[PDB]
């Protein structure tokens, strides 16, 4: 903790103000307008991992209260005890009492509320209702099915979407400026593709790529560096494997799969995912081909998730694809 330069990039680039949150323009604008005119309702932030929910709520709290926001908000998460007793005593006392420092309203942030017990959620209902005159609640979740309908009825819902490509590009540009790094367009495209809308993945991969370069100042991050550090298949490898499977005979397809995998020690699961993504865009005359492909590939993925023989799994992938595509003739 000697300096902020010792922190992982995922935490060292955490937004500190609402202007540093990208890809959520609608939500940010709406919440900013709510706070500007003092019309903030009870909030719910529902979204997938690493979309900026915790960052957004912390930035909102800092904007409302300034730098000394921690002492004027009650933050609870899955690492802390949040039983029914906690709701009855600590949350109730915080909601029913005035602020120590200022005379403003009070904010309670229940981060990762989907891990809360049903009893605590039920106890929270009348607490939210009775003290809404001076207190507001913010809930954060990845899974909505864990939240009771009563709690959802009292909150205004905001959905955090997977980060758009432009936002990831802007954040990558800022990180490159700060770190004095160079990135090629192909490397950026590959990084965005593997991100799947999660900023933390982008930042971790960028840190690994920087660590990989012999000379981070002069060297530039190329797609080869990304593929090496992540140990992921190249698009050319996937195309070659799929072409061999579809066109060549069994012996040649087996040889090609083995050679491609052994060239860089690729994992079979990554190849399966890439081939599924490629085949999604394929136009199939018969729906039965799609049915067979999806079912068999899902079965193989589930089997791989538990281990098993790798060579047999690869042969199973080859055979499943061949059998499924045999239905495009008649």
């Amino acid at each position: 903790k000697r300096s902020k330069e010792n922190l992982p990039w995922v935490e060292k680039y955490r937004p500190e103000t609402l202007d540093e949150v990208y890809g959520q323009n609608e939500v940010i604008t709406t919440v900013r307008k709510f706070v500007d005119e003092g019309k903030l309702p009870h909030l719910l932030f529902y979204g997938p991992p690493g979309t900026g929910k915790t960052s957004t709520i912390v930035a909102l709290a800092r904007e409302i209260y300034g730098k000394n926001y921690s002492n004027m908000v009650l933050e609870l998460n899955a690492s802390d005890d949040r039983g029914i007793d906690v709701v009855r005593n600590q949350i109730k006392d915080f909601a029913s009492t005035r602020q120590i420092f200022s005379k403003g309203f009070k904010l309670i942030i229940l981060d990762e509320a989907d891990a809360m017990t049903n009893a605590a959620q039920n106890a929270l209902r009348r607490v939210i209702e009775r003290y809404t005159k001076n207190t507001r609640f913010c809930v954060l979740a990845n899974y909505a099915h864990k939240l009771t309908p009563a709690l959802l009825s009292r909150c205004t819902r905001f959905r955090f979407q997977p980060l758009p490509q432009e936002a990831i590009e802007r954040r990558i540009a800022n990180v490159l400026v700060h770190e004095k790094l160079k990135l090629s367009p192909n490397a950026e495209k590959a990084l965005i593709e593997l991100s799947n809308g999660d900023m933390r993945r982008v930042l971790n991969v960028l840190q690994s790529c920087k660590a990989t370069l012999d000379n981070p100042d002069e060297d530039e991050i190329s797609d080869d560096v990304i593929y090496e550090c992540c140990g992921a298949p190249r698009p050319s490898d996937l195309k070659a494997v799929l072409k061999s499977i579809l066109e060549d005979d069994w012996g040649t397809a087996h040889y090609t799969l083995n050679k491609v995998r052994s060239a860089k020690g690729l994992a079979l699961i990554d190849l399966i995912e890439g081939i599924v993504k490629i085949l999604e865009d394929y136009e199939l005359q018969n729906e039965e081909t799609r049915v067979h492909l999806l079912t068999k590939l899902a079965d193989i993925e589930y089997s791989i998730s538990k281990g098993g023989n790798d060579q047999i799994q690869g042969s199973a992938v080859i055979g499943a694809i061949k059998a499924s595509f045999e239905n495009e003739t008649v």
Partner: protein
């Protein structure tokens, strides 16, 4: 064992100071500088703030080369402190960039030495300067009387309402089984000045506080025989107990009027 070295002639003083607010907060950051020791903490509910100050005069010997922050857990510190006897001198020792603090109990007459080590914790709670505020009412009264009133009224209800008006202080509680009201007035006696009730009023005040917080606050009555309560309509109540070379302050937020 040279960076910070502080000595208490009697270990009972530090134990009593710690026990004054050990039940209010759990994690405390003690900041030690050449002028003495300070500490500020906020309870889990964020309703009560504890501020402790101890000056150099309270120590037989005190040396602090550079400012040092030490994060401690209250229950562990109290458990270590209760080991020492009342006739043994206490010494707090810390090194540069310490990961722990050493407590040494010495008994020269019996040549008894007891060393304890407490691991420190990283607390990101910066010292919040409490800007001085003008208060509508300031009343100083014996600690025992306030403790008795709080203990009596807390039985009837979970909230205690304090009203200060012209030459009168009223404590009221209303509960399921009944209600209670205690009225006191300013009074000065030269024969027994320690029992005097002093009141200075500018505007009348009326504030409601949680009973449990007051029960925790009154635990500092051992430190000082008198307690000073400062109340304002727009500020949290301030309960101060005066030490020989320092003070212990409790800032309590009142309940919302609704």
């Amino acid at each position: 064992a040279s960076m910070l070295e502080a000595k208490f002639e009697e270990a009972s003083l530090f134990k009593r100071i710690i026990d004054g607010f050990k039940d209010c907060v759990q994690l405390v950051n003690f900041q030690c500088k050449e002028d003495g020791i300070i500490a500020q903490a906020v309870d889990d509910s964020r309703v009560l703030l504890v501020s402790l100050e101890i000056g150099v005069e309270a120590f037989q010997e005190y040396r602090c080369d550079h400012p040092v922050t030490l994060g401690m857990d209250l229950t562990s510190l109290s458990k270590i402190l209760r080991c020492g006897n009342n006739t043994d001198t206490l010494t707090l020792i810390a090194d540069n960039t310490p990961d722990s603090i050493i407590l040494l109990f010495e008994d020269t007459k019996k040549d008894r030495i007891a060393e304890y080590s407490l691991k420190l914790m990283d607390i990101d709670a910066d010292f919040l300067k409490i800007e001085e505020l003008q208060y509508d009412s300031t009343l100083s009264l014996p600690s025992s009387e306030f403790s008795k009133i709080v203990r009596d009224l807390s039985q009837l209800s979970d909230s205690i309402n304090i009203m200060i008006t012209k030459e009168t202080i009223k404590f009221v509680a209303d509960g399921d089984i009944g209600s209670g009201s205690v009225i006191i007035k300013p009074f000065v006696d030269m024969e027994h000045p320690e029992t005097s009730i002093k009141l200075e009023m500018d505007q009348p005040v009326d504030l409601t506080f949680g009973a449990k917080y007051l029960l925790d606050i009154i635990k500092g009555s051992s430190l000082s025989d008198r307690v000073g309560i400062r109340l304002s309509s727009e500020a949290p109540a301030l309960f101060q107990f005066d030490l020989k070379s320092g003070f212990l302050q409790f800032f309590l937020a009142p309940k919302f009027n609704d």
